[PDB]
Design an enzyme around this catalytic site. Structure first.
Site, PDB file in Angstrom:
ATOM      1  N   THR A  64       0.811  -1.230   0.000  1.00 53.07           N
ATOM      2  CA  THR A  64       0.000   0.000   0.000  1.00 53.07           C
ATOM      3  C   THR A  64       0.853   1.294   0.000  1.00 53.07           C
ATOM      4  O   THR A  64       0.363   2.340  -0.441  1.00 53.07           O
ATOM      5  CB  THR A  64      -0.942   0.015   1.202  1.00 53.07           C
ATOM      6  N   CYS A  65       2.114   1.216   0.467  1.00 50.88           N
ATOM      7  CA  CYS A  65       3.043   2.349   0.455  1.00 50.88           C
ATOM      8  C   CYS A  65       3.353   2.782  -0.988  1.00 50.88           C
ATOM      9  O   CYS A  65       3.501   3.978  -1.239  1.00 50.88           O
ATOM     10  CB  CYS A  65       4.327   1.991   1.199  1.00 50.88           C
ATOM     11  N   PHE A  66       3.464   1.811  -1.923  1.00 49.16           N
ATOM     12  CA  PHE A  66       3.787   2.056  -3.335  1.00 49.16           C
ATOM     13  C   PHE A  66       2.634   1.664  -4.285  1.00 49.16           C
ATOM     14  O   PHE A  66       2.819   1.739  -5.504  1.00 49.16           O
ATOM     15  CB  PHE A  66       5.050   1.263  -3.706  1.00 49.16           C
TER      16      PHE A  66
END
EC number: 2.3.2.26
Lengths: 71, 370
Positions: free
Chosen positions: B341-343
């Site tokens: 979810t960060c990228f």
């Protein structure tokens, strides 16, 4: 490039280093600020361990987080 | 399960706890945040359970009938404004700012934001703002851990995953159940009783990775979270949301949104995959087949949220600035699909057929990763 050197305790160490500098040279630069022997140091970028000798441009940038594990 | 059934049940419970007649809420667009604060706090919890008759005096385009949907929409944008010193935000999700002490009344404002979010749920009005996946688990009183740390801090998470998957006893690594805490100078803070003199070993490395992840996700926002839930529980008790998950609660707060499949595929990058790859073509056939209810869950599973920018998938943001939706080739047919979810990166393994992909992805978005 000013990059951050962090630990699992929460400590941080802002150390200035060029992309041509190696992991052995980066661990030696941490001795001037923290005062830990480079053999006891164990750095890692991303999920993989950083090997002493390889350049920082292989693992790859400005304002990055390298996590240090002491031995 | 069925989210439509769970939302219908929760709506019935609120109708029973609802109160008769209504209350007046008068705000302005110029000083909306402060007007709303003064107004919501002037009332009692039982008064805030009555009908919310909201007005924007001297605002062309609104009338003296109900205007709560525009209030809940507009006020949710101003909550995210960093000038109030409550939340830290990305230009153009809500993460409680640990430096909220700057505002001396920050805990009084967090109680109001607690009431505001509990009022949106109770009155069935949607907001155009959202918290992080772990923060929704906080509202649901669900346990938080290493899995949720990836969204807020990916490199700390990556350092903990190395400790989990590699042998610390063979490498001989000095780690104790203790963390740094500051305001003058810095002092140690034990994770477990007498943690400072308890070396991390193979037997308790999973306990250590849990207790550090739990600490990092709430290290300097304890009083703020405690203040938020004072305001939340006095309007809607958290017990009423026990049968929802962090993905259902987000859609219960932010409402359903029709996802544009054309804008999604046009602004999608591919890692070790092509647009004409058998698996990438099966993925868009799957997205076209599933209902919007499951498309939001697939989007949530990959990005961490059903919400999208006004621009579209081109203006999609990650943890390290702008990052478009990515599908990476990782593993084999035997694996289950994973996400970052960060990228906004989906780790899609190279499956042999469409039905295997449909069975593996539909199950991974419903049953999640563990």
């Amino acid at each position: 490039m000013h990059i951050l050197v962090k630990t699992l305790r929460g400590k941080t160490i802002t150390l200035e280093v060029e992309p041509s500098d190696t992991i052995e040279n980066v661990k030696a630069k941490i001795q001037d600020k923290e005062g830990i022997p480079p053999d006891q140091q164990r750095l890692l970028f991303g999920g993989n361990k950083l090997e002493d000798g390889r350049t920082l441009s292989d693992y790859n940038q400005k304002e990055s987080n390298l996590y240090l594990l002491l031995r | 399960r069925d989210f439509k059934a769970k939302v219908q049940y929760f709506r019935f419970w609120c109708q029973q706890l609802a109160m008769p007649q209504h209350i007046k809420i008068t705000v302005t667009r110029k000083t909306l945040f402060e007007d709303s604060f003064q107004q919501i706090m002037s009332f009692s919890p039982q008064d805030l359970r009555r009908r919310l008759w909201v007005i924007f005096p001297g605002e062309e385009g609104l009338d003296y009938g109900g205007v709560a949907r525009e209030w809940f929409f507009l006020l949710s944008h101003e909550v995210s404004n960093p000038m109030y010193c409550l939340f830290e935000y990305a230009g153009k999700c809500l993460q409680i700012n640990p430096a909220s002490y700057i505002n001396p009344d920050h805990l009084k404002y967090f109680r109001f934001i607690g009431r505001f979010i509990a009022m949106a749920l109770f009155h069935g009005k949607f907001i155009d703002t959202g918290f992080s996946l772990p923060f929704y688990k906080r509202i649901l009183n669900k346990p938080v851990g290493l899995k949720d740390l990836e969204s807020i801090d990916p490199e700390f998470y990556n350092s903990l995953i190395w400790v989990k998957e590699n042998n610390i006893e063979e490498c001989d690594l000095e780690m104790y159940f203790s963390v740094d805490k500051e305001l003058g100078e810095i002092k140690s803070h034990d994770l477990k009783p007498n943690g400072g003199n308890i070396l991390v070993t193979e037997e308790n490395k999973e306990e250590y990775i849990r207790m550090v992840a739990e600490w990092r996700l709430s290290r300097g926002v304890e009083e703020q979270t405690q203040a938020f839930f004072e305001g939340f529980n006095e309007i809607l008790p958290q017990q009423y949301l026990q049968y929802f998950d962090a993905k259902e609660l987000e859609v219960l707060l932010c409402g359903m949104q029709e996802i544009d499949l054309n804008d999604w595929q046009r602004h999608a990058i591919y890692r070790r995959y092509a647009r004409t790859s058998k698996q990438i073509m099966w993925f868009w056939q799957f997205v076209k087949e599933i209902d919007n209810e499951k498309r939001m869950r697939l989007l949530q599973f990959v990005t961490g949220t059903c919400r999208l920018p006004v621009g579209g998938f081109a203006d999609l943001m990650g943890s390290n600035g702008p990052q478009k939706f990515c599908i990476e080739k990782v593993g084999k047919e035997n694996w289950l699909p994973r996400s970052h979810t960060c990228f906004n990166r989906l780790d899609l393994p190279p499956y042999k057929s469409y039905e295997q992909l449909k069975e593996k992805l539909l199950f991974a978005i419903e049953e999640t990763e563990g």
